[PDB]
Amino acid sequence: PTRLTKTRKHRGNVSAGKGRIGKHRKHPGGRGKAGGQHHHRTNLDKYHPGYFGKVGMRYFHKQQNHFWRPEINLDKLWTLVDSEKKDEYLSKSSASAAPVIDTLAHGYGKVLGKGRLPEVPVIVKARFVSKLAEEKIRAVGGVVELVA
Amino acid sequence: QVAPKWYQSEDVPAPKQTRKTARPQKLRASLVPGTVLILLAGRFRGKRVVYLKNLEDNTLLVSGPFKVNGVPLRRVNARYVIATSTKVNVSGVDVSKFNVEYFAREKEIKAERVADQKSVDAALLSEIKKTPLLKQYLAASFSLKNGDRPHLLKF
Amino acid sequence: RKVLQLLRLTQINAGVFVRLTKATSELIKLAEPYVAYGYPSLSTIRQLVYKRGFGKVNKQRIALSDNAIIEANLGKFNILSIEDLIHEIYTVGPNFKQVSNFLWPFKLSNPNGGFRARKFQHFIQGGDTGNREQFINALVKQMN
Amino acid sequence: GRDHTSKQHVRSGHRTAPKSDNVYLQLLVKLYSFLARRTDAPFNKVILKSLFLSKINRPPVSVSRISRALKQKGAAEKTIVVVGTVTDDNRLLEFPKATIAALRFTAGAKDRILKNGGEAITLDQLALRAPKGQNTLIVRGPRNSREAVRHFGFGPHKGKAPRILSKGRKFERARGRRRSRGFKV
RNA sequence: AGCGUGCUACUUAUACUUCACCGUGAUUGCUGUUUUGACGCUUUCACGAGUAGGCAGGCGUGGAGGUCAGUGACGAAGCCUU
RNA sequence: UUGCUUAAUUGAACGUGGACAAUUGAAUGAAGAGCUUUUAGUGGGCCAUUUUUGGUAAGCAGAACUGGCGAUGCGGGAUGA
RNA sequence: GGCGAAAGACUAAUCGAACCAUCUAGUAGCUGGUUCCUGCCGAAGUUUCCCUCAGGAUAGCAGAAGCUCGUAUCAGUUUUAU
RNA sequence: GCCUAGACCGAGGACUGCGGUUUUUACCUAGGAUGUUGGCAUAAUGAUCUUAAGUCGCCCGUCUUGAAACACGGACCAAGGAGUCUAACGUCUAUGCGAGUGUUUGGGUGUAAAACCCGUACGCGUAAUGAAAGUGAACGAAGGUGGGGGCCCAUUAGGGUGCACCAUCGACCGAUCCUGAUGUGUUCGGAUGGAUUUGAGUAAGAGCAUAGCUGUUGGGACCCGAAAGAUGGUGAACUAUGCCUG
RNA sequence: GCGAGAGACCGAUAGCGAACAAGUACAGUGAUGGAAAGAUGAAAAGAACUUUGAAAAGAGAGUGAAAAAGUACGUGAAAUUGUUGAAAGGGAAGGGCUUGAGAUCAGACUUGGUAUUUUGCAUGCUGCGGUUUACCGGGCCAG
Ligand SMILES: [Mg+2]
Ligand SMILES: [Mg+2]
Ligand SMILES: [Mg+2]
Ligand SMILES: [Mg+2]
Ligand SMILES: [Mg+2]
Ligand SMILES: [Mg+2]
Ligand SMILES: [Mg+2]
Ligand SMILES: [Mg+2]
Ligand SMILES: [Mg+2]
Ligand SMILES: [Mg+2]
Ligand SMILES: [Mg+2]
Ligand SMILES: [Mg+2]
Ligand SMILES: [Mg+2]
Ligand SMILES: [Mg+2]
Ligand SMILES: [Mg+2]
Ligand SMILES: [Mg+2]
Ligand SMILES: [Mg+2]
Ligand SMILES: [Mg+2]
Ligand SMILES: [Mg+2]
Ligand SMILES: [Mg+2]
Ligand SMILES: [Mg+2]
Ligand SMILES: [Mg+2]
Ligand SMILES: [Mg+2]
Ligand SMILES: [Mg+2]
Ligand SMILES: [Mg+2]
Ligand SMILES: [Mg+2]
Ligand SMILES: [Mg+2]
Ligand SMILES: [Mg+2]
Ligand SMILES: [Mg+2]
Ligand SMILES: [Mg+2]
Ligand SMILES: [Mg+2]
Ligand SMILES: [Mg+2]
Ligand SMILES: [Mg+2]
Ligand SMILES: [Mg+2]
Ligand SMILES: [Mg+2]
Ligand SMILES: [Mg+2]
Ligand SMILES: [Mg+2]
Ligand SMILES: [Mg+2]
Ligand SMILES: [Mg+2]
Ligand SMILES: [Mg+2]
Ligand SMILES: [Mg+2]
Ligand SMILES: [Mg+2]
Ligand SMILES: [Mg+2]
Ligand SMILES: [Mg+2]
Ligand SMILES: [Mg+2]
Ligand SMILES: [Mg+2]
Ligand SMILES: [Mg+2]
Ligand SMILES: [Mg+2]
Ligand SMILES: [Mg+2]
Ligand SMILES: [Mg+2]
Ligand SMILES: [Mg+2]
Ligand SMILES: [Mg+2]
Ligand SMILES: [Mg+2]
Ligand SMILES: [Mg+2]
Ligand SMILES: [Mg+2]
Ligand SMILES: [Mg+2]
Ligand SMILES: [Mg+2]
Ligand SMILES: [Mg+2]
Ligand SMILES: [Mg+2]
Ligand SMILES: [Mg+2]
Ligand SMILES: [Mg+2]
């Protein structure tokens, strides 16, 4: 609402809050990112270091679908087990019958190894796993089965 | 417009308990019964009169005497009076019956008041005659003459 | 300016009691062109405390109109009366600091009779500032 | 005139009331204004101040923080007080039986608390079973974990996060972030 | 009624002292009498210059939702007027 | 305690345990201390005392410290930033 | 572009580049203006960089919002020691 | 110690307090003015307007170190007249839900641009780091030390527990450098142990969405203002010059 | 372009340039440029008639709810101006503060209470104005 703006409060005061010396002008200092190397260097150097220059190699025609690989950690892995059957699985899981967790079918490419698993065997199906994620899965008596 | 609210009461609080216990008035040392006074204000301003009694209203009972002056028995305020140094012996004048209720508001003048005037003025005149020219002095009006400075005059 | 602030003299005609040591004397020497001081008698202290005595109670300026006010704030320092406070100031006592800081700075009037013709020169040179040493009592009588 | 040793007419700089116009938060302030004014219990004065706080000053408290606070020695049966929202944590392996008083509970948080035999009560229910905050334990969430705090105090050699819209090799990584491109700050 | 010097009194600033009132900041207390206002009432103390500028609380105008079963041809709105 | 140091059982740094309680180690004061975010205007200055450079000097030009004017009315200097 | 026995002359009161419409609300570190009330706080003309010197960015000065706490250990001051 | 002259003021509004005199569970001068009298109510009293007198008072706005200026705009009056909207954002605040969040591209539905309902995807978040190939976050009660509100036990003090947060020493992940186990497409692999190195990381998530103020950038961009530049057209009724005919 | 329905839009200096005989009047050789301008009253009932005047008009009259609606038309502000009235005024005027004077406005004999007599009510003496002297007390200005 315009009735809440300070434009309504500046009515009657000559300069509308812009100053009598400074005299609000069109574009003192330039337009946009003008003078970033000359008179706005003190701003870009302080607040945006790394702005100028090239780093790394180009990639013509980069298709981001190639690099799709969402991560799921181990402390979040049992959320992919059915909620209505999690508690039964946490009790009756053994080497003979352990829950299967299809991580790709839930939208994940790599299993990472942050956190702790329940000391319960699981079968984790993944495209990729980290070294520590698979070590933690095997320690609880589980296994990682690679899929594609 | 802003309507009155329910919490805007109209009850009048009682006053707090006041500690202004009155104490009696103190008259000037020059105000002694029998003193000749000069009236400064009122109808009888400038009249020289005899001071008789201190009423309980903080006023002074005063007579001309009426025969000498035309100023009857009445009250005056001590602050509208110059207390001179001339004195008349009023020990023989009975002013017992005179008080605030005597001068109560009820032209025609009461027979009681005329009788009291005559009885008081008889004794007043008997004592006034002793001092020569005192009756003539009381019958003459007071005024400030050219070159009279009341801050330098003795009364 | 800082010295006058540390003496709690932040207005004209404000008075305060100071216990003389080397430190406080060297403080007062810095404020000398702006203050008049001297050695106060017992009757001057009593008149000051009786007429213009106020206490600092919860950072508020409270009149010393009852001995309970003084006791509630200075009873742990064995001050139970206005006369205990006056004695503690006069014969500079072991608890002079607390008793004098409890006293709000005295707010005096202008002198009845005026100052000398020109205030802001030393009392020795015919002015009003500096140490006048027993004539502070006459000045306080003028101003209190 | 006065020689002012401090700025005149300065407001305290603390909230004396909630900015919220929620009438039910104002009922809680009414209840704890009475408790803080009259019980001498320091707990009630802290709760009254916390009810004034803004949203970022009342970060969510995960059900894992409460679990860790109940694992303090001699705190297993204390009443957990959270002036704010209690959220769920699907990274817990187990949750104890506990009494928790909060402004709000998420659906998952309340479900897990009640599933394990505990209570999820409001701050007014707290004031009747503990009008002096007896046997309580106030839990506060992390304030400096907020994303906005990453960029506070940015400067050379400060190690903070730049205010930037895109992330990648082409966005503020060359000159001033690399010795091969001039200098590094 | 000049110059140097001393003294007494006296004159008066929006300054100082006491008091009233306004506002701001802090502060005292208020639910078995909290009692149809607790965003309220109440105790106490201190303070108040201001350009550029910031913020707060209000006044006024066109139109919109709601409400006053509001005013009005027995005179709306507008306009003039110690 | 150590992988440092010493010829060393020597030290260096950080510690467990024990003793020294409000005169806990000068004064005075303290409308409390500490912390953070965000944004405005400004980036022509000038004057007075004292120090001071150039200049014969200047209501001149240039610095130092403080206080002022700018941004400020009020009493005095007749008048006057 | 014309035309000029040449003056930058003349080319419809227009000429060192006509007139009309449009691009076009061209851009302006420059000049001018910028509309109600009260309350509270309240500056800077200085640092560094800039084809920088009538301008910016930066730091400082200012406001606002607060937050953590409640005398904790601070000060445009003195003293003592060095 | 005592006597004495005058001026200004009267905030508060049952009681509560501190004292004093006690002849007394009473009285007082002691937590803020009462008593009494007169007059007036066709009025004494108060306010405003006009005017006189006394005293003070330069023309506003503006840029400026400095304006009443012999600096600029303003003869007068009415009506109009200048920080807006949008895309993308920073801080803060309110709200809903919360490891999620966002119905509104669309579909359903409708009393028909509304309201109501639906869900897949997608966006942001939940993982970082490296130029990249790539790799990818628990020694421990998610660590130790000094503080730390609150809570618990106490009984000044004292002890226990200590979230947020502050300082500090560590641990984990990525990059860089060093070391280089069993092994092997003999050039690959990279276990293990390290390093005054480095990251916008981990270390029991905090975000997402809507709205508001303020600030930012691009847009006509607070309003008005160039000298210029370009594209496409209209003019030799004036005038310059040639020609034709008088 | 044609045909429709709408709006937290503008309300005659606004909204299209144009609410009207508006791309009109008018300008320019030309390309082009380009306005101003809505409102009597329900209805003309748009003032018959007499009189003064050369006439325009005026004065009577008439219509109308209104002529304080007469086409120079609803309302009819300001600048600016006439008349009447009031006041002030020696090379400006205007302003603030204060009081006087003149003018205006305001307010307690209160919604005053106490008994009292008569004038008036639909009515069967009862709510209650009315009056003057008494008393209680109040308001204001003062000693
Ligand atoms: Mg201003
Ligand atoms: Mg203006
Ligand atoms: Mg501004
Ligand atoms: Mg301007
Ligand atoms: Mg500027
Ligand atoms: Mg005198
Ligand atoms: Mg003098
Ligand atoms: Mg003041
Ligand atoms: Mg983070
Ligand atoms: Mg290179
Ligand atoms: Mg003279
Ligand atoms: Mg002389
Ligand atoms: Mg004053
Ligand atoms: Mg101010
Ligand atoms: Mg509008
Ligand atoms: Mg009606
Ligand atoms: Mg700026
Ligand atoms: Mg700047
Ligand atoms: Mg200059
Ligand atoms: Mg400038
Ligand atoms: Mg200036
Ligand atoms: Mg000044
Ligand atoms: Mg002057
Ligand atoms: Mg002179
Ligand atoms: Mg030439
Ligand atoms: Mg020509
Ligand atoms: Mg423009
Ligand atoms: Mg420039
Ligand atoms: Mg100020
Ligand atoms: Mg350059
Ligand atoms: Mg300029
Ligand atoms: Mg009173
Ligand atoms: Mg003058
Ligand atoms: Mg100007
Ligand atoms: Mg100049
Ligand atoms: Mg000016
Ligand atoms: Mg001049
Ligand atoms: Mg000129
Ligand atoms: Mg100019
Ligand atoms: Mg002009
Ligand atoms: Mg207007
Ligand atoms: Mg999603
Ligand atoms: Mg994502
Ligand atoms: Mg990657
Ligand atoms: Mg973390
Ligand atoms: Mg232009
Ligand atoms: Mg042009
Ligand atoms: Mg060009
Ligand atoms: Mg021709
Ligand atoms: Mg339409
Ligand atoms: Mg138009
Ligand atoms: Mg038009
Ligand atoms: Mg019209
Ligand atoms: Mg005729
Ligand atoms: Mg009419
Ligand atoms: Mg009409
Ligand atoms: Mg008309
Ligand atoms: Mg007029
Ligand atoms: Mg003349
Ligand atoms: Mg007058
Ligand atoms: Mg008068």
Side-chain angles (χ1 to χ4, degrees), chain B residues 33-61:
Chain B
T35 306
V36 167
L37 314 176
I38 302 169
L39 308 182
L40 312 168
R43 168 192 189 163
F44 299 114
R45 58 197 173 275
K47 284 296 215 313
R48 279 134 179 172
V49 292
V50 191
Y51 171 44
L52 296 177
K53 185 188 190 189
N54 188 35
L55 303 191
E56 56 283 5
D57 192 359
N58 295 345
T59 52
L60 318 174
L61 172 70

Side-chain angles (χ1 to χ4, degrees), chain A residues 29 31-53, chain D residues 154-156 162-164 171-177 183 185:
Chain A
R31 289 210 192 205
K33 304 198 191 67
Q37 275 168 326
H38 308 266
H39 60 290
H40 298 137
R41 172 178 294 214
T42 60
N43 186 276
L44 294 176
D45 278 27
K46 178 164 172 143
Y47 294 125
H48 309 97
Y51 182 71
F52 297 105
Chain D
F154 187 92
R163 268 165 188 161
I164 199 175
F171 308 105
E172 293 179 354
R173 291 199 191 271
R175 173 196 165 270
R177 288 301 289 170
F183 60 96
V185 298

Side-chain angles (χ1 to χ4, degrees), chain B residues 1-19:
Chain B
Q1 206 60 262
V2 193
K5 304 285 154 41
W6 64 264
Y7 49 74
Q8 311 197 29
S9 296
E10 271 194 343
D11 61 357
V12 176
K16 275 170 144 277
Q17 296 298 109
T18 300
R19 291 179 185 172

Side-chain angles (χ1 to χ4, degrees), chain C residues 106-117:
Chain C
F106 293 88
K107 313 197 314 160
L108 311 172
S109 175
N110 281 321
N112 191 26
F115 287 99
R116 285 162 163 186

Side-chain angles (χ1 to χ4, degrees), chain D residues 45-54 58 83 103 138:
Chain D
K45 306 197 168 60
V46 166
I47 296 305
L48 177 62
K49 267 162 60 78
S50 312
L51 290 164
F52 305 158
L53 289 168
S54 74
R58 309 177 278 98
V83 190
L103 266 186
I138 297 172

Side-chain angles (χ1 to χ4, degrees), chain A residues 81-134:
Chain A
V81 174
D82 183 27
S83 296
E84 300 300 12
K85 293 178 72 68
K86 186 184 287 185
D87 307 304
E88 157 191 1
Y89 285 170
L90 280 168
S91 279
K92 294 180 176 66
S93 195
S94 64
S96 302
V100 179
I101 309 175
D102 200 5
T103 50
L104 173 63
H106 288 89
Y108 298 105
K110 184 159 186 181
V111 172
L112 291 179
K114 189 211 196 179
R116 293 176 162 165
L117 285 164
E119 293 179 353
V120 174
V122 297
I123 298 168
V124 185
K125 291 162 70 188
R127 272 185 188 164
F128 304 91
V129 296
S130 74
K131 208 214 181 190
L132 182 66
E134 195 202 355

Side-chain angles (χ1 to χ4, degrees), chain D residues 112-175:
Chain D
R112 167 170 277 137
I113 295 162
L114 303 176
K115 184 177 180 180
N116 293 276
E119 283 184 273
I121 71 171
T122 59
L123 293 188
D124 63 357
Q125 296 180 271
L126 183 63
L128 281 71
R129 62 179 70 188
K132 289 210 290 192
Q134 311 101 351
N135 191 359
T136 61
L137 189 153
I138 297 172
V139 180
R140 303 190 268 193
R143 274 199 195 173
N144 280 13
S145 294
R146 204 164 49 107
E147 208 272 326
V149 189
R150 297 205 312 146
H151 316 286
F152 288 165
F154 187 92
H157 321 290
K158 289 305 181 54
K160 305 308 299 281
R163 268 165 188 161
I164 199 175
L165 290 189
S166 292
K167 209 190 181 186
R169 87 176 167 76
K170 298 196 307 184
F171 308 105
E172 293 179 354
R173 291 199 191 271
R175 173 196 165 270

